[PDB]
Amino acid sequence: FGTNGFDIPTIAIALLIVGVIIGLSGLILSIFATATASAISNPSPGTLAYNLTHPLINGMVSFFSFFPTLYVLLGVTGIVLIAAGIISIIMEKF
Amino acid sequence: FGTNGFDIPTIAIALLIVGVIIGLSGLILSIFATATASAISNPSPGTLAYNLTHPLINGMVSFFSFFPTLYVLLGVTGIVLIAAGIISIIMEKF
Amino acid sequence: FGTNGFDIPTIAIALLIVGVIIGLSGLILSIFATATASAISNPSPGTLAYNLTHPLINGMVSFFSFFPTLYVLLGVTGIVLIAAGIISIIMEKF
Amino acid sequence: FGTNGFDIPTIAIALLIVGVIIGLSGLILSIFATATASAISNPSPGTLAYNLTHPLINGMVSFFSFFPTLYVLLGVTGIVLIAAGIISIIMEKF
Amino acid sequence: FGTNGFDIPTIAIALLIVGVIIGLSGLILSIFATATASAISNPSPGTLAYNLTHPLINGMVSFFSFFPTLYVLLGVTGIVLIAAGIISIIMEKF
Amino acid sequence: FGTNGFDIPTIAIALLIVGVIIGLSGLILSIFATATASAISNPSPGTLAYNLTHPLINGMVSFFSFFPTLYVLLGVTGIVLIAAGIISIIMEKF
Amino acid sequence: FGTNGFDIPTIAIALLIVGVIIGLSGLILSIFATATASAISNPSPGTLAYNLTHPLINGMVSFFSFFPTLYVLLGVTGIVLIAAGIISIIMEKF
C-alpha cells in the first residue's frame, strides 16, 4: 500500500516501536533515579563532603532538564517524515 | 478488477490490515502505559527524586500528545491514495 | 460476453468478492474493537495514567472516523469502472 | 465528431477530469486545514510565542484568500477554449 | 486539454501541491516555534544573559515578520502564470 | 510549474528550510549563551581579573549586537529573489 | 471437500481439538489454583511475612487477570482463518 518506500502498515509499526521504546526508557530511568535518590545522602551545608558532591547533583539536574526538548524534537521529526511521504505520493501518483 | 495496479479487493485488504494494526498498537500502548503509571510513584514536591524524575514524565506527556496528529495525517494519506487511483482510472479508461 | 476485457460475469464476480471482503472487514474490526473497549479502563480524570493514555484513544477515534469516506470513495470507484466499460463498448461496437 | 482536434466527447471527458480533480483538491485541502486548525494553539496576546507565530498564520490566510481568483480564471479559460474551437469549425467547414 | 504546455488538469494539480506544501510549512514552523518559545527563558532586564541573548530573538522576530510579504508575492505569481497561459491560448487559437 | 528554473513548490520548500534553520540557530545560540552567562563570574571592579576579562565580554556584546542587521538583510534577499523570478516570468511568457 | 488446503472436516476436527484443549487447561488451572489458595495463609497485616509474601500474590492476580484477553484474541483468530479460506475458495473457483 504505497508507491516506492512509503508503506502505511510500516509507518504504523514504526510508531508502535518508537512508542514502546520511549515508554521503556522512561520507566527504566525513573526506577533507576529513585535508587539514586535513595543512595546519596545530605552530609551538611558547608563541610568537605558537600563541596565534593554538590556539583555532581547539579550536573544531573541540568542534563535531565535538557531531556524534555530532546523528546519534543524527536516527536516533531515524525510529522516531517509523514509530510514528506504525502508529498512524494502526490508528486507522481498523478 | 482494475487497470494496472489499482485493485479494489487489494485496497479493502489494505484497509483491513492498517485498521487491525492501529487497533493493536492502541491496545498494547494503553496496557503498557497502565503499568508505567503503576510503577512510578510521587516522592515529594521539592526533594531530590522530584528533580531527578519530573522532566522524564514531562517528555512522556509531550510525545504522547504528539501522537494524535500523526494518526490524523496517517489517516488522510489514504484519501489521497484512493483519489490518485480514481484519477488514474479516468485518464486512460476513455 | 464482451469485446476485449469487459465481461459481465467477471464484473458480477468482482462485485461478489468486494462485497464479501468488506463484510468480513467490518465484522473483524467490530469484534476486535469490542475487545479493545473491554480491555482499556478509565483510571481518573487528571492522574498520570490519564495523561499517558488519553491521546491514544483520541487517535483511534480520529482514524475510525476517517474510515467512512474511504468506504464511500471505494464504492464510487465501481460506477466509474462500469461507465468506462459501457463507453468502451459503444465506441467500437458500431 | 470534429474536424482536426476539436472532439466533443474529448471536451466532455476533459470537463469530467477537471471537475473531479478540483473537487478532490477542495476536499483534501479542507480536511488538512482542519488538522492545521486543531494543531496550532493560541499562546497569549503579547508573549514570545505570539511574536514567533502570528505572521505565519497571516501568510496562510493571505494565500488561501488568493485561491478564489485563481479558480475563477481557471474556470474562464474553458470558455475561451470552446469559443476557439467553435470559430475553428466555422472558418473551414464552409 | 490545451495547446502546447498549458494543461488545466496540470494547473489544478500544481495548485493542489503548492497549497498542501504551504500548509505543511505553516504547521511545522508553528509547532517548532512553540518549542523555541518554551525553551528560551527570560533571565533579567540588564544582566549578562540579557545582553547575550536579546538580539537573537530580535532577529527571529524580524525574519518572521518578513515572511508574510514573501507569501503574498508567492501567491500573486500564480495569477501572472494563469494570465500568460490565457494570452498564449488566445494568440494562436484563432 | 514554471518556465526555466522558477518553481513555486521549490520556493516554498526553500522558505521552509531557511525558516527551520534560522529557528535552530536561534535556539542553539540562546541555550549556549545561557551556559556562557552561567560560567563567567564577576571578580571585582578594578582587580587584575577584571582587566583581563572585561574586553572579551565587550566583544561578545558587540558581535551579538551586529547579528540583527545580518538577519534583516538575509530576510530582504528573498524578496529580491522572488521579484526577479516574477520579472523573468513576465518577460518571455508573452 | 476443498481446493488446496481448506478442508471442512479438517476445520471441524481442529475446532474439536482446540475446544477440548482449552477446557482441559481451564480445569487443570482451576483445580491447581484451589490447592494454591489452600496452601498459602495470611500471617498478619504488617509483620515480616506479609512484606515477604504480598507482592507474589499480587503478581499472580495480575497475570491471571491478563488471561481473558489472551483467550479472546485466540478465539478471534479462527474467524480470520475461516474468512481467509472462504476468500481463497471464491478467488479461483470461478
DSSP per-residue letters across E20-67: HHHHHHHHHHHHHHHHHHHH-----SSSHHHHHHHHHHHHHHHHHHHH
Find the helix packing angle between G8-39 and G48-93, rounded to 10°. Answer: 180
Measured between alpha carbons, how far is C4 from C91 in angstroms, rounded to an integer? 12
Give SS3 for B43.
coil
Residue G58 exposed, middle or buried by CB count within 10 Å (0-12, 13-18, 19+): exposed
Question: Quick check: E28 and A87 CB within 8 A?
Answer: no
Expressed in percent and rounded to 5, the helix, strand and coil fractions of chain G are: 85, 0, 15
In whole angstroms, what is the distance from residue G5 CA to residue G85 CA?
9
DSSP G1: -
In one letter, which amino acid is D34? T
Angle, CA of B74, B80 and B82, to the nearest 5°: 110
Residue of F nearest to E42 (CA): F34
CA distance C9 to G26: 51
Q: Which of E21, E24, E34 to mutate to test the interface with A (most CBs of A within 10 A)?
A: E24
C-alpha cell at F62: 558587540
Which residues of F lie closer than 8 Å to E, measured between beta carbons?
A: 1, 8-9, 11-13, 15-16, 19-20, 22-23, 26-27, 29-31, 33-34, 36-37, 40, 57, 60-61, 64-65, 67-68, 70-72, 74-76, 78-79, 82-83, 85-86, 89-90, 93-94
- C-beta atoms surrounding F85 within 10 Å: 21
Q: Please report, for chain F, how many H helices and E strands are present, in that order.
A: 2, 0
CB A37 within 8 A of CB B49: yes
Is C74 in contact with B86 (Cβ distance < 8 A)?
no
* CA atoms of C65 and F69, how far apart (whole Å): 50
Q: Cβ atoms within 10 A of the Cβ of E65, count?
A: 15
Rounded to 10 deg, the angle between the F48-93 and F8-39 helix axes is: 180
Calculate the alpha carbon distances from B12 to A89, A90, G71, G87 in Å.
Answer: 19, 21, 27, 13
**Residue among E42, E40, E22 at smallest CA distance from E30:** E22
Only one residue has cell 538577519, namely: F71
Give the closest residue to B75 by CA, choosing from C59, C66, D39, A77.
C66
User: Which cell goes with C10?
Assistant: 467477471
Task: Return all residues near A62 (Cβ < 8 A) that are at least 6 apart.
Answer: none
Lookup: cell for E34: 512553540
Interface contact D84-E82, CB threshold 8 A: no
Which residues of chain A lie closer than 8 angstroms to E35, CB-CB? 69, 72-73, 76
The residue whose grid cell reads 545580518 is F70
Using an 8 Å Cβ cutoff, are E50 and F64 in contact? Answer: no
Q: Detail the DSSP E strand segments found in chain D.
A: none
Can you read off the three cell numbers belonging to residue A9? Answer: 502498515
The alpha carbons of chain F give a radius of gyration, in whole angstroms, of: 22
Cβ-contact C31, G76 below 8 angstroms: yes
Tell me how the structure was determined: cryo-EM
Helix (H, G, I), strand (E, B) or coil at E85: helix
Other CB atoms closer than 10 Å to residue C13's CB: what's the count? 16
* Angstrom distance (rounded) from CA F81 to CA F5: 12
- The answer to whether residues A37 and B52 touch, using CB atoms and an 8 Å cutoff, is yes
For cell 487517535, what's the residue? C59
Q: Could you identify the residue written with the cell 466533443?
A: D8
Residues of E within 8 A of D62 (CB-CB) are: 68, 71-72, 75
How far apart, in whole angstroms, are the C-alpha atoms of residue B80 and residue D22?
13
Cβ-based contacts of B19 with chain C (< 8 Å): 25, 29, 63-64, 67
Q: Where are the alpha helices (DSSP H) in chain B?
A: 8-39, 48-93
The answer to whether E12 and F2 have CB atoms below 8 angstroms apart is: no
Nearest CA in chain B to C59: B68
- Say how far apart CA A26 and CA B24 lie, in whole Å: 22
Which residues in chain A are closer than 8 Å to E32, comparing Cβ atoms? 76
Chain B residues with CB inside 8 Å of C41's CB?
Answer: 34
How many Cα neighbours within 13 Å face the side chain of C89? 11
Question: In angstroms, rounded to a whole number, what is the distance separating the alpha carbons of residues C21 and C9?
Answer: 18
Q: Of the candidates B36, B73, B72, which has an alpha carbon nearest to the alpha carbon of residue B56?
A: B36
Distance CA F78, CA A89 (A): 29
Please, what sign has the CA dihedral across residues A5, A11, A13, A15? positive
**Closest CA of chain E from D91, distance in Å:** 10
Of A71, A58, C45, A36, the closest CA to residue B56 belongs to A71
- 3-state SS, residue A87: helix
Q: How far apart are the first and last CA of chain E?
A: 16
Closest approach of chain E CAs to the CA of A83, in angstroms? 7
CB atoms within 10 A of CB G70: 9
**Which residues does chain B have within 8 Å of residue A82's beta carbon, measured at their own beta carbons?**
70, 73-74, 77
- To the nearest whole angstrom, how far is the Cα of G38 from the nearest Cα of chain C? 30
**Cell digits for E64?**
518572521
Alpha carbon distance D66, E72 (integer Å): 8
Query: Which subunits sit against C, judged by 3+ Cβ pairs under 8 A?
Result: B, G
- Nearest residue in chain A measured CA to CA from B90: A94
The residue to which cell 477515534 is assigned: C61
Taking the C-alpha atoms of residue F84 and residue B2, their distance in angstroms, rounded to an integer, is 47
Q: Rounded to whole angstroms, how far apart are CA atoms E59 and F75?
A: 10
| SS3 of residue B3 by DSSP | coil
As a whole number of angstroms, the distance between CA E83 and CA F47 comes to: 73
> C-alpha cell of F8?
513555486
Distance CA C12, CA C10 (A): 5
On whether the CB atoms of residues E21 and F13 are closer than 8 A, the answer is yes
The answer to whether D81 touches D5, Cβ cutoff 8 Å, is no
Declared resolution, Å: 3.8
Structural contact between residues B52 and A42, judged by C-beta atoms closer than 8 angstroms: no
Residues from B contacting C (CB-CB < 8 Å) are: 1, 8-9, 11-13, 15-16, 19-20, 22-23, 26-27, 29-31, 33-34, 36-37, 40, 57, 60-61, 64-65, 67-68, 70-72, 74-76, 78-79, 82-83, 85-86, 89-90, 93-94
End-to-end CA distance of chain A: 16
Q: Considering Cα of G59, then G60, then G61, then G67, what sign does the dihedral take? A: positive
Count of C-beta atoms within a 10 Å radius of residue B51: 17
Nearest-by-Cβ selection for B68 from C11, C58, C69? C58
Residues of D at the B interface, defined by Cβ within 8 angstroms: 13, 16-17, 20-21, 24, 27-28, 31-32, 35, 38-39
